Design a binder for these strands. Sequence first.
DNA 1: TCTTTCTATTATGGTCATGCTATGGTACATACATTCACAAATGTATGTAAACGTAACCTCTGTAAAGTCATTAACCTATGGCACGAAAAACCAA
Length: 105
Amino acid sequence: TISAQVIDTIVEWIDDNLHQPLRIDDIARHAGYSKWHLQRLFLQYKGESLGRYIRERKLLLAARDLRDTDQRVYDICLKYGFDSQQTFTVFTRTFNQPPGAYRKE
DNA sequence: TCTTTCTATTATGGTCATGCTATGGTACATACATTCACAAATGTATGTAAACGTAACCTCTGTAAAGTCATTAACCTATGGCACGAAAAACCAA
C-alpha cells in the first residue's frame, strides 16, 4: 500500500485511456494522487522518467499494429498517442530500425 | 281323566297452559315445674398519652478520571540548482 493504492489504478488508467498524452496536469487530477503521489512511485517502482516510459509503452503497443498489416502508417502513431509523425519517427533513437523495414517484418 | 262360564288387576300421550281456596263441632278442676324476660356485677376490652431508635438526609471537603491545550519537531508546500529526455537541425550513405 503506497499512497492508498495508486499502483492498482495507474495501470488501469493507462490501459483504459485513449491516445491522450500523459502529463503532470493531465494525470494529476482524476488520478486521486498529485505530483508527489506519482514522483515517489516513478522513483521507486519504475526508476525512469515519464517521457521515456510512455514512449516505450507506445512503441511496445505499436509493435503489434505494425505487424497487423495496416496500410495507413500515418494513423498508427496517432491512434496510440504520438500527435505528430516526426516525433514518432523516437523510433530512430530507440530501435535505429527502419519504420518501413520493421513494418515489412 | 279334561276345556268353557264365572271372580278380580293392569291399560292410553303430553305437550301449548288456565283461575280463587275452605268444608258442621264436641267439659272443666287442682298441679307442679320448664322456660322467657329483666335486675346487677365481672372480665377482658378498646382508645388516649409518652419514651428510644433509626427508617435516615442534606451539607461539604478530598480523591480520581476525563475533555482540552502549553511544548517541539515531522513532514511538506515552497525556493534555487543541476541532470534528463524529447524535438528539431545537420550531414552522410545509397
